[PDB]
Amino acid sequence: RASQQIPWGIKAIYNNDTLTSTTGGSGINIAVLDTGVNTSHPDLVNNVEQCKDFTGATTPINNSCTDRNGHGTHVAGTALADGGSDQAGIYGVAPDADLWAYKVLLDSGSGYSDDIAAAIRHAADQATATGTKTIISMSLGSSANNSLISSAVNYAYSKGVLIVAAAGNSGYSQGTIGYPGALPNAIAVAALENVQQNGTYRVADYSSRGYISTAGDYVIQEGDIEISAPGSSVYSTWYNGGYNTISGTSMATPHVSGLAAKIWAENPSLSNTQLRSNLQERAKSVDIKGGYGAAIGDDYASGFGFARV
Ligand SMILES: [Ca+2]
Ligand SMILES: [Ca+2]
Ligand SMILES: [Ca+2]
Ligand SMILES: [Ca+2]
Ligand SMILES: [Ca+2]
Numbered sequence: 459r460a461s462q463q464i465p466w467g468i469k470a471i472y473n474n475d476t477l478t479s480t481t482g483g484s485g486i487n488i489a490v491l492d493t494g495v496n497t498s499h500p501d502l503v504n505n506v507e508q509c510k511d512f513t514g515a516t517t518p519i520n521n522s523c524t525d526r527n528g529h530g531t532h533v534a535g536t537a538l539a540d541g542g543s544d545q546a547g548i549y550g551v552a553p554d555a556d557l558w559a560y561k562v563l564l565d566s567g568s569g570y571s572d573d574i575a576a577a578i579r580h581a582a583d584q585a586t587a588t589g590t591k592t593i594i595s596m597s598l599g600s601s602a603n604n605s606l607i608s609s610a611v612n613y614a615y616s617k618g619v620l621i622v623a624a625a626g627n628s629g630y631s632q633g634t635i636g637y638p639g640a641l642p643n644a645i646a647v648a649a650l651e652n653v654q655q656n657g658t659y660r661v662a663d664y665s666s667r668g669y670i671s672t673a674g675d676y677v678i679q680e681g682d683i684e685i686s687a688p689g690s691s692v693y694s695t696w697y698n699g700g701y702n703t704i705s706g707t708s709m710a711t712p713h714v715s716g717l718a719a720k721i722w723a724e725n726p727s728l729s730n731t732q733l734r735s736n737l738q739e740r741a742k743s744v745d746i747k748g749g750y751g752a753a754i755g756d757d758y759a760s761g762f763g764f765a766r767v
Contacts, residue, residue, distance in 0.1 A: 459500075459546055459547065459700070459701075460546065460547050460548050460701060461693065461701065462548070462693050463478075463479075463541065463546075463547065463548050463549060464477050464478065464479075464480075464548070464549055465536075465548065465692060465693040465694070466652050466688065466691070466692075467536070467650075467652075467687070467688025467689075467692050467709070467713055468480060468536075468549060468550070468551065468713075470650075470652070470659070470688050470764075470766075471551060471687060471688065471713050471717060471764075471765075471766055471767060472551075472766070472767045473766045473767060474767075479541060479545075479549055479553075480549040480550065480551060480552070480553050481553065481554065481720075482551075482552050482553070482554055482555075482719070482720035482723050482724070483538060483551075483552030483553065483554040483555030483716070483719040483720050483722075483723045484554040484555070484723050485556075485590065485591065485723055485726065486552065486555045486556065486590075486591050486592070486593065486719040486722045486723050486726075487507065487508075487555065487556045487557075487558050487584075487585070487588075487590055487591070487592040487593065488534075488537050488538055488552070488555050488556070488557060488558065488592075488593050488595055488712075488715055488716065488719055489508075489558040489560055489577075489581040489584075489592060489593065489594045489595065490530060490533055490534045490537065490557060490558070490559055490560065490595050490597075490712070491560045491562045491563075491574060491577050491578065491581070491594060491595065491596050491598070492525075492529060492530030492533055492534070492559075492560075492561070492562065492563055492596075492597055492598070493525050493526070493527040493528075493529045493530035493531075493561060493563040493564075493565060493567060494511070494523045494524050494525035494526070494527070494530045494531075494559060494561035494563075494697075495509070495523055495525050495530045495531050495534045495557065495559035496524075496525050496531040496695065496696070496697045496698070496699070497509055497523065497524075497559070499531060499535070499539075499695050499696075499699065500542035500543070500544070500546075500547050501535060501539040501540060501541060501542045501547035501548055501549075501695055502531070502534055502535060502538075502539060502540075502557060502695060503542075503543075504540050504542075504543060505538050505539075505540055505553070505554075505555060505556055505557045506557050506559060507556040507557055507558060508556075508557075508558035508559065508560070508584065509521055509522065509523035509559045510522065510523060510558075510559070510560050510561070510577075510580070511523055511524075511560075511561045512560060512561060512562045512573040512574075512576050512577040512580070513561055513562065513563070513564055513569070513570075513573055517573070517576055518560075518576070518577070518580055522561070523559040523560065523561045524561070525561075525697040526565040526697060527563075527565050527566070527567055527697060528696050528697040528698075528702060528704075529563070529567055529597070529704070529708065530559065530561065530563070530697075531694075531695050531696055531697045532692075532694040532695060532696060532702060532704055532709070533595070533597045533694070533708060533709070533711065533712045534550075534557055534559065534695065534712070535548060535550055535694035535695030535701075536550050536551065536692060536694045536709060536712040536713060536716065537550050537551060537552060537555070537557075537595060537712035537713075537715050537716035537719070538550045538551070538552050538553055538554075538555045538556075538557055538712075538716055538719070539553060539694070539695055540553035540554070541553065547695075548693065548694065548695065548701065550694075550712070550716050551712070551713055551716025551717050551719070551720060552716040552717070552719035552720045552723070554723065555716070555719040555720075555723070556590075558581060558584070558592070560577045560580070560581065562574045562577045562598070563598060569598060571600075571604040571606050571607050572606055574596075574598070574604075574606075574607050574610075575604075575606035575607045575609070575610035576610075578594060578596075578607065578610035578611060578613070578614050578621075579610045579613050579614065581594050581614060581619060582594075582613055582614035582617040582619045583617070585614075585617055585618065585619050586617050586618075591618070591722055591726065592618075592619045592620075593619065593620045593621075593622060593715050593718050593719055593722070594614060594619055594620070594621045594622065594715075595622050595623075595711055595712055595715035596621070596622070596623040596624065596638060596639075596644075596711065597623075597624050597706075597707070597708035597709070597711045597712065598623070598624065598708075599623060599624055599625075599626050599636035599637055599638060599639055600636055600637055601626070601628065601634075601636050601637075602637065603637040603640065603641070604637065607637065607638050608637070608638065608641055611638055611641050611643050611644055612643055615643040615730065618729065618730050619730060620645070620715075620718055620722075620730045620733055620734065621638070621641075621643060621644040621645065622644070622645045622647060622685075622711055622714050622715040622718060623638045623639040623641075623644045623645065623646060623647065623711060624636075624639055624646070624647055624706070624707035624708050624710065624711045625639045625646045625647055625648045625649070625665055625666040625667075625668075625683055625707045625710075626639065626665075626666030626707055627649075627664045627665065627666060627706050627707055627708075628664075628666045629661075629662070629663060629664050629665045629666045629667050629750075629759075630661075630663050630664070630665070630667055630749070630750040630751065630759070631667060632667050632668075632669060632670060632751065632758065633667065633668070633669050633681075634666040634667050635666045635667060635668045635669075635681055635682075635683060636666055639666075639707075640668075640680055640681050640682075641680065642678060642679060642680050645678075645684045645685055645714065645718075645734065645737070646668070646682065646683050646684050646685075646761065647683075647684070647685050647686070647687055647689075647707060647710045647711045647713075647714045648661055648665045648666075648683045648685070648686040648687075648689075648707065648710060648759065648760050648761060649661065649662040649664070649665040649686070649687070649688070649689025649690060649705075649706065649707045649709065649710040650662065650686050650687060650688050650689060650690070650710065650746070650760075650764065651688075651689070651690035651691070652688070652690065652691065653748070654748065655747070655748025655749065655752075656747035656748045656752070657747060657748075658744075658745065658746050658747045658748050658752075658764075659686070659688075659746060659748060659764060660746075660748030660749045660752075661686060661746060661748060661749030661750070661751075661752055661759045661760050662689060662690045662705070662749065663749070663750065664705075664706070664707075665689065665707055665710075665749075665759070666707065667683070667750075667751050667758050667759055668681050668682045668683045668758035668759075668761070669681045669682070669758055670758055673756055673757050673758040674755060674756050674757065675756065676738070676742060676755075676756045676762055678738075682758070682761065683757075683758060683759065683760060683761035684738070684741070684761040684762060685714045685737060685738075685741050685761055685762065685763075685764070685765050686710070686741070686746050686760040686761060686763065686764045687710040687711075687713035687714045687717075687764065687765070688709070688710060688713055689705060689706055689707055689708070689709040689710030689713075690705045690706075690709075691703055691705055692704065692705065692709035694709070714737070714765065717737070717740075717765055717766075717767070718733060718737055720767070721733060721736055721737065721740075737765050738762050738765075740765035740766060741761065741762035741763035741764060741765040742756070742762045742763050743763065744763045744764040744765070744766055745763045746759070746760035746761075746763050746764050747760075
């Protein structure tokens with residue numbers, strides 16, 4: 459059923475061209491705030507743990523999270539598909555992690571800021587209620603900084619949740635990074651393509667760029683890109699079964715949230731801030747130098763670099 463059980467981006471983040479399966483993430487929840495997720499997909503069913511809808515007339519709506527788009531299923535599979543109970547499916551970065559499928563985007567792929575904020579806060583409240591470590595993964599954003607979403611991100615970060623979000627797809631001009639990725643308390647993820655330039659993976663032209671003034675110090679301020687990860691031509695799970703290939707910072711984001719889950723599950727006593735630092739140091743050790751604006755060191759195209767296993 460799968461054309462590639464181990465897509466290029468999984469091999470790249472694992473730094474193993476002959477990887478046959480992935481591992482890790484046990485006990486970490488990845489809250490995928492998106493268009494929903496296909497709950498019966500063979501390669502996700504073993505990890506579905508929560509399924510809630512934030513787009514309806516009351517909120518949350520429990521035991522409802524249906525994906526009619528594909529984007530949310532696809533993102534989920536990159537983070538944590540497990541190969542299925544027959545091992546014949548695809549693998550994501552952290553196949554032992556738990557999925558919290560929170561539908562915050564309408565079937566069109568667009569979502570309202572109040573709904574997104576509500577889901578960010580609910581993920582945090584569920585982390586606190588359950589006593590379990592949680593990563594919010596947001597393959598979404600806007601050029602504008604909504605204060606409902608910002609305040610929700612702060613709330614979650616204060617409850618010990620890690621927030622990972624897409625940089626956006628408005629590149630490659632300076633200053634195109636969107637929100638919530640551009641928030642100080644969110645890890646903004648740039649997209650790599652499977653091309654080498656200057657001896658490294660290349661940032662995709664579409665990937666939104668941060669700002670010159672605050673790049674270079676390996677300290678995240680508002681507007682800074684943080685992690686790069688595979689985003690172009692990514693094969694993953696799809697909403698009606700099956701698989702599909704789509705591109706974007708949306709695809710890069712779950713590589714990072716899955717990596718973060720894999721790292722946290724190893725090292726499960728880390729705070730969110732310590733986990734964040736571990737991810738930053740991984741990235742720093744793999745400097746990205748390809749693509750417009752990319753440079754030696756921390757830069758506004760690729761952030762600190764490409765965090766790998
Ligand atoms: Ca759990
Ligand atoms: Ca609403
Ligand atoms: Ca940020
Ligand atoms: Ca900075
Ligand atoms: Ca660089």
